[PDB]
Amino acid sequence: DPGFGSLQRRLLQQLYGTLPTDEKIIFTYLQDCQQEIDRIIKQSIIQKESHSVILVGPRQSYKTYLLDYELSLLQQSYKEQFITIRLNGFIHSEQTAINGIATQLEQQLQKIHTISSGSLTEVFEKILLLLDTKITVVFIFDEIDTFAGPVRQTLLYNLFDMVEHSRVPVCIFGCTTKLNILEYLEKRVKSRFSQRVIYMPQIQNLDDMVDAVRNLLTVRSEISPWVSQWNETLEKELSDPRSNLNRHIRMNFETFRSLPTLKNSIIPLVATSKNFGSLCTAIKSCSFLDIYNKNQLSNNLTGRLQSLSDLELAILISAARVALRAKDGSFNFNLAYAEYEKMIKAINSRTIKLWLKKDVKNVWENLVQLDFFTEKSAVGLRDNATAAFYASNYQFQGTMIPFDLRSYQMQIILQELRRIIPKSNMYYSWTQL
Amino acid sequence: VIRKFTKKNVARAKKKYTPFSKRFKSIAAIPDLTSLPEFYGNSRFENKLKTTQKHQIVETIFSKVKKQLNSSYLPARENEFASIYLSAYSAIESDSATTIYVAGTPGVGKTLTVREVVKELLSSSAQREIPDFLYVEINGLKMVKPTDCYETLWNKVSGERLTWAASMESLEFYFKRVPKNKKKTIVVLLDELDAMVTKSQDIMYNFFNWTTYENAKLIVIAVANTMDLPERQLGNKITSRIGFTRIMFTGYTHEELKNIIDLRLKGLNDSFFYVDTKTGNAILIVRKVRLRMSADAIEIASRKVASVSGDARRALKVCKRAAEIAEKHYMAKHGYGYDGVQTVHITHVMKALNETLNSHVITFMTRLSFTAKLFIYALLNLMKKNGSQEQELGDIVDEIKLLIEVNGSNKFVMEIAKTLFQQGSDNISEQLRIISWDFVLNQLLDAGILFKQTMKNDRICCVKLNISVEEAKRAMNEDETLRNL
Amino acid sequence: NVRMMLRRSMYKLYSAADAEENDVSYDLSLVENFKRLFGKDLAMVFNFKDVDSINFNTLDNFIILLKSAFKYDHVKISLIFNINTNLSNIEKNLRQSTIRLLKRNYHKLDVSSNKGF
Amino acid sequence: NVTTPEVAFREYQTNCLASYISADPDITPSNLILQGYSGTGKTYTLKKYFNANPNLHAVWLEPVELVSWKPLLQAIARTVQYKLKTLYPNIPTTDYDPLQVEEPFLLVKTLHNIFVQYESLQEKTCLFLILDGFDSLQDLDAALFNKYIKLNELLPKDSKINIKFIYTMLETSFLQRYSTHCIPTVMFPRYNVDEVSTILVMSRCGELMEDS
Amino acid sequence: SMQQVQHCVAEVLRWSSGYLKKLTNATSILYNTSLNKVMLKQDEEVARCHICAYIASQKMNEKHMPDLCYYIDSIPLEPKKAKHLMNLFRQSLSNSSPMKQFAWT
Amino acid sequence: IEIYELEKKIGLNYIAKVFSKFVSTRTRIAKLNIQQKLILCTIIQSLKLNSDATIDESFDHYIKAITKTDTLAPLQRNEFLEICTILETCGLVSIKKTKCKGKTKRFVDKIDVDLDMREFYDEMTKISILKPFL
Ligand SMILES: Nc1ncnc2c1ncn2[C@@H]1O[C@H](COP(=O)(O)OP(=O)(O)OP(=O)(O)O)[C@@H](O)[C@H]1O
Ligand SMILES: Nc1ncnc2c1ncn2[C@@H]1O[C@H](COP(=O)(O)OP(=O)(O)OP(=O)(O)O)[C@@H](O)[C@H]1O
Ligand SMILES: Nc1ncnc2c1ncn2[C@@H]1O[C@H](COP(=O)(O)OP(=O)(O)OP(=O)(O)O)[C@@H](O)[C@H]1O
Ligand SMILES: [Mg+2]
Ligand SMILES: [Mg+2]
Ligand SMILES: [Mg+2]
């Protein structure tokens, strides 16, 4: 059935957003904000007016999506009128952004018709001579908050000076998740900034999510013979308020309120269907969404507890008992083994094997590996590479004492252990202190 | 030869190492540097950003207004101008070396006044009342390294390209040992002086100690943020050498900002334009349309900006934003695309001024999901009971569980408890965290609403509110469910 | 740390291989491409001086890091542990998976000055 | 156009791999995560999936060997161009040195310079980079994975070679640090006792029988 | 500040009654909005509330009682300066949301 | 000499002109309205209790002081930071960005005051409605 293959490919590329520019999907709650972006681009590329603007919104809130849509829409009619320089706050540092801007300037200027040669002082001086009809330079500057540090903000200073005073028209689109982005800026940088902040729209009601799902899953072109029947199946499942798809949209609205989150589950529902009737049954039932939701929680604390052996569960209950009785919540191997040994004698007195410390050591190491115990006052994963490098050159005191004396703390407490251990388990009576 | 690491991206400038002190036999053998071709300055990139235009772009009535209010394109700076011009003129005429300290808040016209003083001095030197001088401008924030100033100034003096230490000794020898009849006066503007402050203060001491030399003929105009920058960040030697007579650039009053904006809009306010009604293109002297921007709107914008900052950039940007809002409404109502009286009203000015005053924190928290609001609400309850301002995440988990299990007769909670704890599904076990727990935790950390401690234990890691508590409560008081319980 | 151990080991390996038979990254990918760069195969003998004074977490992580070279067909690795106290001190500082890894081919050799007079 | 293999207790994971991995870059995610603890069949399922589909172009890297971020970048730069030479031997190429990469933007520039010389190809294809054990890096920090999520955005959209990243993770907390990025994740839960018994029998009886 | 608002509207015009209470409430709301939105020099501040009271009075004459009379003379400033500041206040705070949600009736 | 030839022997008055030109919290307070004096009272009161308090914690104190007094309409957080910027311009407030020193260490913006406390209480006790806010 090549028609179902065509319909499945079309549904997948609608869900990945990789349609052509004239066919690309903009949601209703995203129109006006897009139109605002559509003004600023068109005031820079076409009318040669310099702009600086920061888009503020959470992750996966269609900032990059709307910016790429605007650049691709203006790319097909005004191609020689602008160049694009992309910087990212994660990849580019404060010193490597100059080289990134320079090499992007050569690979963009020859694409229409040197800067990046020499030392950093020479390259920055040549950039300042180049920037400080005319071709509009458009800066897309993601994670702008990483360059608004509390020490010195040289690149933001120079770029906003390029917006303010240069004879070359410059458009800067910063993007961030920080709501209070204007307080991050230094006073002179804040003075040179245009104070134009666009906050991305949030989903306000369930009808916005249902309308966006309808936009994502309706085939508005006739490239398969199965398109029409799929459209009435989708409209029947979306217009029914008591359907499974509306229930899953409502669950996403209350918990995540994220259309990429829903798309990551809808994509393997479409892709794993083999024919048209299987796809219709899958979208009517949405049982694959339940299987997806079960798999997304399979490596959490509950699913990791349900994979434990009897001795592992016994040692974990013993360590939780010792941690609940302790005031700092701290324990070691010796106290947990004492609690385990007392528990096994009190079970066998009313058989169950007592394992020796030599064999309980491996169980303890697996429990540390499965993130049930943490080392006491452990920082863990560091935020940046410099702090991790400093941590790698220091010998911690926990790594020099024997393992039976290392202090540990519980990731799950005994009250949480009693809730999800079944009452038919043989160690269930020891989950209450 | 096997190398322990490689540096395969070395970019080394072609700058020489021999300083100026070793290129002549003696002090008496140095020739007249004024009569030298490379000395004292005696653009190749401008062609690269030009293209051919094949569309007649439509400039409306407000386009000339918005181009007019740009900072790139002095009624209120006449005493600062007089002081700086008198000091610099007296130092040029008497072959003296001096320091002029200027400081102020952003956008109060410091750089503009210094550049106008320098242009008027060049005009005076063109008609021969003062000896000829070189002008050098060094911005501390446009330097990759702070020592590049040493590389810059000497390159403006001799035309040579040296390394920074060799340039520093070259400048030292030139200022100290070269006689005044053999050299030329140099006026150097040090802009953004706080960026030239290092840990050892080498550059600051060198630049303000060269001004104390007899043979230097060096005038340094140092532009800074504050009056007490030497008394805070510099030693007593540099503070002594800078001096005591320091020039304040105070913020503009509302009359001065109003005069600046009216001097921008002098030729186009209350004027007439030829506007083609089919397209909207406006031509200064088909409908004759009269353009005005009201003086009351400009006045109150000047009053607000003058009370806040005195920033001329802020006043110009507020007026430009009001013109942009009026132009957006005009192009919306007239159906004008991109290829009888038009008034920039006071409501547009008040829309421009309030746009940076409306807070999207409460609006952002109002439109969050139920689980993020439940997180914030439980955190507020913990701050109410134990009063810590930092709450453990396990305490938030147990407080969320308690708030669910106590209000178990609330209809919304009855409808949503299976969603929070099983994702609406059988075959999914009772979970220890709610659904989208780390999702809303990372969402509130991304927005800057929360601060999270760097620990690897998820329960005793603490979380602090980064915003004020009453706006969080306010946002929690808008919701119909969290109001009830 | 483990990174310095690997970098010193791979610099020593590359220096010896060039000293007998363009530079590479001092990293375990040199073990991967050793036959492609030198033609012969490889036998590494690791001698750990003063194991009682080393950080046993760092040594343990280096042992699991060296375990990753078993999937390459041309690699043989020998380890020599110079122990000064006894084996019961070093079997309680390593993890049990490391002990199970080291048990498949190991030889004790009690060589000292008091051995048999 | 994907063959779905048969893994004995990883049917959902194999179906998810068939759903997410394809030769079309138009319907393939930029980033894909396979999260599971040790001995859960992540590597086994990924090898069976790529062995059942030989048209998929995969580059296998082990970050546990690479130890730090700089040899990981150099390994990406070396192995991508080696695979591209062994994939299209009739394309004239310039051999860029992988040791030129000391910073992530240098990786972006090197990948751009490698990919612009394959524009004579007819169809857009995917190059899959499997970082099997990303959080097993001994010099790991929280900011490193953020540089790899956004790496496709600094690469040209209209390229014939479109790089796709497949990550493998061990710890749940490391994955849950990046939950708001909404990367598609397939999770590999730990086997139960009957499953590990069956796997042990069908993986070890053949060499227990033929022992000397 | 209730005594100040009462004194200013008493000087402008000529207390639980409906029209006088609504006039004082409107004058208080304009005063509270005026302290933040319109920024006054030291002398002109002394005549703030009078101006606020004045425009409140004008609104009543606009609707709800065309017979109510008011005299600008009670503002202590120069009458040109007082009228100009009154024009600024009236144009700036007529379109405010508290007086878009107010109940003049 | 510069002052003499800018206004046009040199006497005592020009030396005093230099020393007054190139070199006060009573006059700064007197140039404020009743809303800005109210904010400056709650800022100093919030800094006695904490002395390491952010702008959000200073705004936190100001809302509680209004609700027990009901003097002037309560205003928003960004309107509060604007008045703090007005008092920044006047010199009564000195806003810095420094790192907090709790369990979670990040960079926060906090209010510092350095005005003369002897002249602050004299200017505020003349106004009757501000005396609850001392
Ligand atoms: N160029 C693009 N073409 C198609 N879809 C895209 C494009 N860029 C992003 N998307 C999709 O948009 C959704 C999320 O939007 P987007 O990536 O723009 O968010 P964002 O707010 O910019 O994110 P962040 O803060 O993480 O940078 C995802 O489903 C993603 O796949
Ligand atoms: N007196 C003035 N007359 C006209 N325009 C002015 C005046 N002062 C400032 N401006 C405008 O404000 C802009 C900013 O002024 P300027 O660059 O001199 O500020 P600054 O005081 O040096 O501030 P910063 O500390 O941020 O460098 C000028 O480019 C000009 O457009
Ligand atoms: N489903 C299975 N069917 C058959 N054999 C299996 C299966 N799962 C695992 N195995 C066997 O167990 C071995 C371990 O699996 P694998 O290497 O894929 O684990 P992993 O989860 O990737 O581990 P790690 O995180 O430690 O690298 C496989 O190499 C294979 O021999
Ligand atoms: Mg983005
Ligand atoms: Mg300046
Ligand atoms: Mg593996």
Side-chain angles (χ1 to χ4, degrees), chain A residues 192, chain B residues 111 191-192 313:
Chain A
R192 284 155 175 83
Chain B
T111 308
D191 216 334
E192 325 292 352
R313 288 180 191 120

Short mmCIF file of all heavy atoms in Angstrom, two decimals, chain A residues 192, chain B residues 111 191-192 313, ligand 5:
data_model
loop_
_atom_site.label_atom_id
_atom_site.label_comp_id
_atom_site.label_asym_id
_atom_site.label_seq_id
_atom_site.Cartn_x
_atom_site.Cartn_y
_atom_site.Cartn_z
N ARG A 192 22.54 51.02 25.78
CA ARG A 192 22.62 50.83 24.33
C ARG A 192 21.58 49.85 23.80
O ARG A 192 21.35 49.83 22.59
CB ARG A 192 24.03 50.38 23.94
CG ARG A 192 25.05 51.49 23.97
CD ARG A 192 26.46 50.98 24.16
NE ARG A 192 27.43 52.06 24.07
CZ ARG A 192 27.75 52.87 25.08
NH1 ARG A 192 27.21 52.73 26.28
NH2 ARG A 192 28.64 53.84 24.87
N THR B 111 30.85 61.38 25.66
CA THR B 111 31.61 61.11 24.45
C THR B 111 31.31 62.14 23.36
O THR B 111 32.22 62.58 22.65
CB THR B 111 31.30 59.70 23.95
OG1 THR B 111 31.48 58.77 25.02
CG2 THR B 111 32.19 59.30 22.79
N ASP B 191 38.24 56.18 26.83
CA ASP B 191 36.84 55.93 27.06
C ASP B 191 36.67 54.57 27.73
O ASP B 191 37.38 53.62 27.41
CB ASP B 191 36.04 55.99 25.76
CG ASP B 191 34.66 56.58 25.95
OD1 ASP B 191 34.13 56.49 27.07
OD2 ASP B 191 34.12 57.16 24.98
N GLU B 192 35.69 54.49 28.63
CA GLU B 192 35.40 53.33 29.49
C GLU B 192 36.63 52.94 30.31
O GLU B 192 37.23 51.88 30.14
CB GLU B 192 34.85 52.14 28.68
CG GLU B 192 33.94 52.50 27.48
CD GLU B 192 32.58 53.10 27.84
OE1 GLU B 192 32.22 53.13 29.03
OE2 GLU B 192 31.88 53.54 26.92
N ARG B 313 19.64 58.62 25.34
CA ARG B 313 19.33 57.42 24.58
C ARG B 313 17.95 56.88 24.94
O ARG B 313 17.19 56.46 24.06
CB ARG B 313 20.38 56.34 24.83
CG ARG B 313 21.73 56.57 24.21
CD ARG B 313 22.65 55.41 24.56
NE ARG B 313 24.05 55.68 24.22
CZ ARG B 313 25.04 55.70 25.10
NH1 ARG B 313 24.83 55.46 26.38
NH2 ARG B 313 26.27 55.95 24.67
MG MG G 5 30.44 57.06 25.70
#
